[PDB]
């Protein structure tokens, strides 16, 4: 056996993956032993928590080279904001400078957004008295999370990239001077993939956005008009 | 690009840079920037030699949104399933990733109710490095756990991140030195074990019902992506050449 | 009933609802429950405010069910939907800022989470501590915690019922602003002033649109939480935990 089961205290079960030969890749052995380990847990209602762990410097390695090869062989005022979104291939919004209002929102529709620490970012629609447009009300909560989006959108405040970074955004935030160079490097790493794989994957990741954006725009239009 | 407000630059053969440079309007949406941006993206759509686009502004301006004039006009009204083992387990599961988590092995741990990473270890959803699309429910569990935006980069680029890099990017997982990871998992597990089993299972069932309900449709969509991407000679050479 | 909530009109368009049941440290006494409802009804009947600031006193934001209150649910005399405090900030037409200058415990933490803006104090303690008493989270915690803090952190928060300082949450990466306690209310006031720069109708229209999925989805989750309370609340060992661990 390549999975060891260790009880800790009364009701804790540790599942320790130890396929040293394969560094916890999914050999036949690790696969079978993992399934049996979870089946054993399922048959035992003493346990209240499971610790799944690896050994040494390996948690789990994924498909072995031969297992991947087996699969390979078969054994196994209404448009511009969404330009990035409708683009077939990945778009990096390298916002080396300020992104204000619809300019910010336009960039938020890119697959990868990079900010600059010194620049100003704002969904400032409500500063003019208007409810937000250009799909702001959809793309802000979707990229920045529901809670930060309520603040951004209700208040239309201005944040430096450095503020957003301290608030916890998922975007890479860099000094202005480094923004482009980081984007070109990331673009180079992206271009190492087959173009069909990039498009196939982006189509699947952004389908709910492409599907739901039109109705959000309609609701945003109805908010104007009131 | 016509109005001369958007410059296209090819970087290498497969990367196009769309640079917005309406200096007069500081990259606000003037007529020219609008038409030039639409023309730039149409150019991209009709030139599928590119694999990535970089959209950028000039100097201190990315894009300034509606013009002041435009906005005033409006105001005025003139215009075997290894991957789901942790998810199907009735009790809370802690993935103590004291070591590297690579591809399906990373994804398998992300289905746990609590994930802990090591600072020193490397984590990657590396499917796309081999040319094929992510499987094992990655395109569901990675955005579910790490948020839509970070998951885009992780999945599309198949990058390697130390636990310390993810901790800097803002993950909700606890990240510790390798040598503390298991001790902390055991302390957490002992705290969970203070609860009645029935309350733990009833609550897990409720918290993860929408994952158990949705995962099978996502797996189906990932299979559909694998049919389109897995069975190309290019995938076989990347597996032979780039593995470990 | 009748002086455990103070209402202060802080400027022409800003109202502060301050909870100050000192006897119960802002646990949900009958008096606190009644005054909070009354204060939100007053805001609903006077449609001139643009922002509400909900805050506590000294070191307490809100402490959740009183011990007696919890034991009545345990006995099956009541259920947590009997008085609906949990959703006051969500049902409010205008933006609500939860200025949590002090501790936020159980139903008191969750009630604050329904506000449109949440500010935490670094040195205060926050916890969805339901499970520590052996029963499942109610007050809509299983909806609002994952909504505001993200699926992954909510798992831990809800399952383990652990206590976090504001500093701990800040470190774990929450989208809420976390401040020294002494700065929390002034910062709430400043943000309320920036909110009060917008037209009231615009703020109401936008909040209605932003919180519509929450107002639509909450009632089904509350029903599921009532079902979990049916399976978990009325055990003897819950009474033992309430009696043994409260405080």
Numbering used by the authors:
A (entry chain C): 4 to 79, 83 to 232
B (entry chain A): 1 to 79, 84 to 248
C (entry chain B): 2 to 248
Article passage:
In this study we present a structural and functional description of the bacillaene synthase β-branching enzymes PksH and PksI. There is a single active site per PksI monomer, with each active site positioned on the periphery of the trimer, ~ 43 Å from one other. Akin to PksH, PksI adopts a characteristic CS fold, with a ββα core, that comprises two approximately perpendicular -sheets surrounded by -helices.
Two crystal structures of PksI were elucidated; the first to 1.93 Å resolution using a crystal cryoprotected in glycerol (PksI_GOL), and the second to 2.1 Å using a crystal cryoprotected using ethylene glycol (PksI_EG). In the PksI_EG structure all the active sites adopt the “closed” ground state conformation. In the absence of bound ligand, the PksI active site adopts an “closed” conformation, where the side chains of residues Phe81 and Phe136 occupy the central solvent exposed cavity of the enzyme active site. In this state the catalytic residue His230 is found to point away from the centre of the site in an apparent catalytically incompetent conformation.
